[PDB]
Design a protein around this ligand. Structure first.
Ligand SMILES: Cc1ncc(COP(=O)(O)O)c(CNOCC(=O)O)c1O
Ligand SMILES: Cc1ncc(COP(=O)(O)O)c(CNOCC(=O)O)c1O
Lengths: 432, 430
């Protein structure tokens, strides 16, 4: 314990001494934004690195350190940092004029493409973020059903004002939430049945992202579909992260159909983006000719997003590319798990396809409860260790593949995990 | 008579725009009513906009219009400003989706804090809606209270709209909805529910309800009562921040605890911000504060670059003031014209923002407009299209930097022709 404290203090010091420009920048920025910060996930102690430049799957900090990027804008940056297909589409759109203040020539074609790639989406609308998409989805479900109660799950993350521990987070909007255990099929069935008439919607990630890439089990997710249908509630799949996991998203891979689906991240080509869609009869609430619900938002249909999204999905992150990237991720996750098992350490990587997360526990991880006892200092040691090995990762150990990452890049990550185990044998919890 | 005039307008508009009609029918398949943003829809179908340059727009059928709506105040720079485009290209060449603190966000944060000194610290969001949601969340946690005072006709974003009651799309916070520009009801209700009230949220001029200025005595009553009671005052200046060199609140000399921003501040890119008192913003300091606020595109280099470029090179404080003066002169001409012709018609608002209304007398709240014949607005809208003017269905008129004095003359002229050709349909003054 005292040895871990000491290794961490050493990590902080080396990180500090090697990054004076990032420190200077942090001090200066702290005057105008709380903790110099506009986005909580980007902050880490002692201070976060300022990123100066990006190209392909490479990033450079303010002090000129070059890293292989293994976080890729928290799944939004699947195209890498400098894709010409994206840039040229944005440029052409700007030359056509921006802020066009009307229905445009670009939105319809992106909407079509999305509905075709995700056939469970009969109609959709665009929002400016995943947080907005989920808000609008929940708003629609409450009005469509005439009910107020929303079922969500422990560890669930659905945006800036829609996060949950065992209870709603301090920033979570005061909808009537019923928070149930993730991957507990029996409790879900019972609680949904018991409160049937009150439940407007069951909102769930098919794999939880923020909580640590925790796959939703077949039985649990089928139970949610059956229970919701039973009591007359809408099932909403949050596929903001999860849609990239297979050629047509994770829900379709699993064979489960939700009433509504929310999207975000990469679908806007790396531009600000969200969307909510599903059954045409639910979406009809927003049909301005006949529906009772209004949904405005200044930048909903902006030409930059509309252009960059269509370019990205058609030229780069195609359904086939999504399958192929998922294959690489599975291969990677298997190598990492075999390594951890072989070295006898209480360490694993959980996830699906091109998304995984480091965890310092032995055994099956089925919910965030299984990670409650974990020593958070261990994640930090790994993060700083990866920086030393020219790898830019997430503080939470969230590993995210992007298209430009080479097989050699992947090898470097595996080697870095290996050197981490071998350097910290005295410090890491044992498997048994 | 009005029914027939409206049917004729629909016919004329339909026949002149078949490509827009065809685009609409095809788009209706994948988006409800072909639509992703409600304000953009109007009957019988909305124009598809194909191109923009300066303060000009082209529809799918090739018509060129002078632009008098300008992305609902967001498009203050026009549709093709080189300073914005060059700044965005520059940022893209340095790489996008940078996944961390970057070199551009601090410049823009400092700029906002300096130009709007009521903002000591801020955080960026992806829209005005998020900014308002985050500010409300901050206020509730800071005060430890639940009740939120808002005003009828108030619009604060997609899930924060109010008539006399919250709109069906509004998040179920504990809202107390009060009449706009009613100082006596505001004072009595705020004191009655004092210890429960975390926050008073108000636009210093209501936008969506029809450019209705908040009266000084009313807005001061809000500041006074909020302070008296221990509630935070939040000014929603998403629209209103453009109205003076340092925003409307500063023009009026009133200081809110928090301010929300949006629209043009991100240079034409997706943008929102909330900020104010450093001690309230401390709740979000990741080092010591209990509140978390992520959001993947919050600090994106595109927005950071365009925002800084627009605010330093184009829509400077001086430019904001000059545009407001041109707006004041336009509104005065329009009101003189309407009074001249004896019609029950007027333009309300401040500076570069105004709104057509078919009533006589003082417009103080949405109640004053409840009984207006909506067909007159449509008639005006279609008439302006005929005169190659692109405005909003609701009669919202928005100035932008590239609009020439000759463009503005055309707008006045077109209202003149509107009055003179529809004199038999318009309500009379007195
Ligand atoms: C005072 C005020 N606050 C907040 C807002 C919300 O800002 P945003 O649309 O960026 O969420 C708006 C306007 N939002 O406009 C809708 C549209 O033009 O489609 C607003 O007027
Ligand atoms: C399942 C899910 N839904 C919704 C969201 C929220 O989407 P958005 O951040 O676009 O509001 C997220 C992730 N948002 O990440 C925060 C950040 O990277 O700063 C998400 O994982």
């Amino acid at each position: 314990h005292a040895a871990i404290d000491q290794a961490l203090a050493d990590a902080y010091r080396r990180f500090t001494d090697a990054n004076p420009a990032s420190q200077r920048q942090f001090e200066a920025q702290a005057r105008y934004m709380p903790g110099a910060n506009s986005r909580s996930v980007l902050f880490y102690a002692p201070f976060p690195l300022t990123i100066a430049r990006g190209e392909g799957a490479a990033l450079w900090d303010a002090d000129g350190h070059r890293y292989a990027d293994f976080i890729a804008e928290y799944t939004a940056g699947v195209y890498g940092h400098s894709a010409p297909e994206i840039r040229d589409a944005v440029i052409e759109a700007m030359q056509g004029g921006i802020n066009l203040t009307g229905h445009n020539l670009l939105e319809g074609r992106l909407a079509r493409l999305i509905c075709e790639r995700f056939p469970q989406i009969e109609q959709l609308r665009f929002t400016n973020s995943g947080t907005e998409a989920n808000l609008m989805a929940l708003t629609a479900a409450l009005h469509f059903t005439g009910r107020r109660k929303i079922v969500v799950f422990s560890g669930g993350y659905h945006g800036g004002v829609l996060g949950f521990g065992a209870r709603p987070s301090p920033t979570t909007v005061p909808f009537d939430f019923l928070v149930l255990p993730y991957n507990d099929a029996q409790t879900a069935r019972a609680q949904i049945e018991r409160h049937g008439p009150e439940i407007a919607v069951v909102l769930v990630e098919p794999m939880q992202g923020a909580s640590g890439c925790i796959p939703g089990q077949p039985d649990f997710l089928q139970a949610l579909r059956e229970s919701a249908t039973q009591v007359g509630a809408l099932l909403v799949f949050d596929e903001v992260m999860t849609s990239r996991l297979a050629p047509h998203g994770l829900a379709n891979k699993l064979g489960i159909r939700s009433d509504l689906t929310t999207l975000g991240k990469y679908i806007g080509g790396g531009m600000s983006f969200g969307a909510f869609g599903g059954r045409a009869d639910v979406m009809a609430l927003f049909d301005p000719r006949t529906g009772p619900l209004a949904h405005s938002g200044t930048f909903n249909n902006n030409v930059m997003t509309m252009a960059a999204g269509y370019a990205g999905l058609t030229k780069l992150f195609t359904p086939e590319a999504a399958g192929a990237l998922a294959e690489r991720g599975e291969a990677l996750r298997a190598r990492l798990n075999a390594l951890c098992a072989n070295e006898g350490v209480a360490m694993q990587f959980t996830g699906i396809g091109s998304l995984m997360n480091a965890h310092f526990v032995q055994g099956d991880v089925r919910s965030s409860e299984d990670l409650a006892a974990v020593d958070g200092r261990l994640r930090q040691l790994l993060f700083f260790h990866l920086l030393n090995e020219d790898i830019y990762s997430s503080p939470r150990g969230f590993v995210v593949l992007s298209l430009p990452l080479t097989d050699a890049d992947i090898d470097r990550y595996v080697a870095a995990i290996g050197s981490f185990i071998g350097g910290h044998g005295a410090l890491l919890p044992r498997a048994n």
